[PDB]
């Protein structure tokens, strides 16, 4: 005992397929727009970011209490510096390379470790590497 109930359901299900298809297509395009929008937004913010003063490069002598670290800025001797809240004091190992902020000199990043002094020493000595196969008699 239904009227156009079948006709309505046919109409509604017809629109649902187009709506679901278009909604899926729109989500594809929105992500494409967002990715391009993020690229533009990051590009404009980069110009302000590049004007932020660079960080010093120092060498950790030893860690101290209260998150204090004794460093040696490359031309400017020794300093006692803070540690950024995002850097663990336990990772600050002696003779490590760290980045210090421009004004506060705060330890804010552990740079990749420099050449080991022994490796540096053995680089100038340059003893030829040898194996048992290249020894005769």
């Amino acid at each position: 005992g239904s009227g156009l109930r079948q006709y309505y359901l046919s109409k509604i299900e017809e629109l649902q397929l187009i709506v679901n298809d278009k909604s899926q297509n729109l989500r594809r395009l929105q992500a494409q727009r967002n990715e391009l929008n993020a690229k533009v937004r990051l590009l404009r913010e980069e110009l302000q970011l590049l004007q932020e003063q660079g960080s010093y490069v120092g060498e950790v002598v030893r860690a101290m209490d209260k998150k204090k670290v004794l460093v040696k800025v490359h031309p400017e001797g020794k300093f006692v510096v803070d540690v950024d809240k995002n850097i663990d004091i336990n990772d600050v190992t002696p003779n490590c390379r760290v980045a210090l902020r421009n004004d506060s000199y705060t330890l804010h990043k552990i740079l990749p470790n420099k050449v080991d002094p022994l490796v540096s020493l053995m680089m100038v000595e340059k003893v030829p590497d040898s194996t048992y196969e290249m020894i005769g008699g």
Partner: peptide, 17 residues
């Protein structure tokens, strides 16, 4: 990156994209 300025100081700075 790490760059060595001719002023005699090593800096940890950003690179233009």
């Amino acid at each position: 990156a790490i760059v060595g300025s001719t002023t005699g100081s090593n800096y940890y700075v950003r690179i233009l994209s």
